[PDB]
Amino acid sequence: EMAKPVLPDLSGYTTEAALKKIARNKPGKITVARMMEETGLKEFIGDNKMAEWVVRQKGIPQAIMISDGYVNLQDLVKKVPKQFLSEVSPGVYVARLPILVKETGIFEIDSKTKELRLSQEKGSFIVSEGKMLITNTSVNAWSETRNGLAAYRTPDEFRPFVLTWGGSQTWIAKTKMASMGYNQSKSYGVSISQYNPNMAKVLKRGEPTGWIIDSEFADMWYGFYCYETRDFVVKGNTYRDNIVYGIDPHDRSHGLIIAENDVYGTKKKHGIIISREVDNSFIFRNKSHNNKLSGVVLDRNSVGNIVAYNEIYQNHTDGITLYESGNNLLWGNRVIANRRHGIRVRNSVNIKLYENVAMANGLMGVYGHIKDLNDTDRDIELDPFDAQVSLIMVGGELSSNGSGPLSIDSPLSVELYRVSMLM
Structure with missing residues (x-):
């Protein structure tokens, strides 16, 4: 009858391939500015909605910002005040402001970082409008109060998350992440997104993309989420003991490669779910149990x-x-x-x-x-x-x-x- 399916070559999808995907030669500007000045922050939050962040930061809400060139975690550590980016032990950092990588930004965390802890209480999180590469490390949602992971308690309680916008490109490899995300738009855990349909009309950026490879995701609200994303690759990952979904690609995404993942222990709903016109994609050689x-x-x-x-x-x-x-x-x-x-x-x-x-x-x-x-x-x-x-x-x-x-x-x-x- 019919020939067996022809599935994508996964051999190019490598931590070593990944590392060669960013331009490190031109630095590298680092500001600490107000969040409401930035479209990439207004687009999932803001003005009549900044109260919660003023409370979390105890003051006018600010972010760490990277643009025009290249910055790594260690670069940020040197230039940003200790109160906001603190190295609590060698290779271990606590961020007490969100980090926004702007459109012309290129942000890297590599093996030099043992663990980057995003403070829950100070409302830290990561948004990238540009290039971001995270390899051989840990990025975790961290409770300063509990002195540990911001373990899941309830849907509406904020936890740090990673989100990427339209026009962006993101590579995560050999990285561990835990306890990220909650019941709140674009904040599900690790979220790849085109802009909200209005702002996309204006910005006219391309659909976002990248790889998540050989990494592990536990206690996430959603392990992976995406919206109008093209050709994203999710290979070789473990999604363990997440809250609502393991892998949740969404809303007009297409050409996705979800392969050789081990997805299990999801506490409320499914392991892997594609939903609402997620077309022309490939789900193969996964363990979903x-x-x-x-x-x-x-x-x-x-x-x-x-x-x-x-x-x-x-x-x-x-x-x-x-x-x-x-x-x-x-x-x-x-x-x-x-x-x-x-x-x-x-x-x-x-x-x-x-x-x-x-x-x-x-x-x-x-x-x-x-x-x-x-x-x-x-x-x-x-x-x-x-x-x-x-x-x-x-x-x-x-x-x-x-x-x-x-x-x-x-x-x-x-x-x-x-x-x-x-x-």
Whole structure:
């Protein structure tokens, strides 16, 4: 029938490749100015909204700013007052103001830094409108009160985060990060974003991009988040014990590479979820296991994607769930012992399920259904749907699931070819 999928070459995505991606030759200006002077800060916060930051800083709200050239952490440390950027032990720093890398800025943290602690109480965080590279180190949300990580307690309690804007480029490699992010726009944890639709009209910057490679993310509100992002690469990472999602690419992102990640322990929702027109992307060779909800989710008209060769096991609901995201290819996933269904397809058409293995799930191996979603929380205007399900199933195996190999309610069409179904 159909040839096996052609998946992107991951071999270029290297800490060594990464290090050669910035221009270090031209420094390097460092100011400490007021936050409200800067578009890159106004765009997720500000004036009638600066009260919280005045409280956190105990004074008129200020940021550390990098622009026109190159600055590393150690560079910042020397020029910025101790009260704001303090080295508490060799290689260990506490930032007590947010750090903004401006458009012409190039900011680097490398192996010279043991750990950079963002102060929770003083409301520290990182925003980059430009070039940023973080390699061989730790950047953690840090409670000065608790003398430790700003461990998660409640959704609305601020924690430090990393966010990047449109026009920017970001490479994180061999880096550890913990306890970042909370329930607040563009503040989810590590967030890659185009500008808010208004400001993008004016700035006309390109969609943001970069890599997150061989890094580890724990206790994040969302492990990864992105909005209108192009060609971002998430390879070789561990997402452990995060609060809401492990990896959460969003809102018209496209051409993404999410590969060879180990995503588990997600406390509230899914391991990996792409949502709202996340198209033409690749989710392959990932371990997504033991999340409170599903292993992998394609949601809200996310189309033209390839979910290939993923190890999806022991999630507390479905292994994979497709929600109103038609025209996707699931090839050769091993979907094993999830508490509910192995692969569930709701309101999606032309799903191709080739060579999947669905074993020992609590319910059906493969389950396809429809559901009228009109008088619900769904913004039918933003996220339309059509209550029809159709799928092509070729090869693979459905075995020892609790409720049976497959069940497809009211399908428009289902074709099955040479599928193994053991009794």
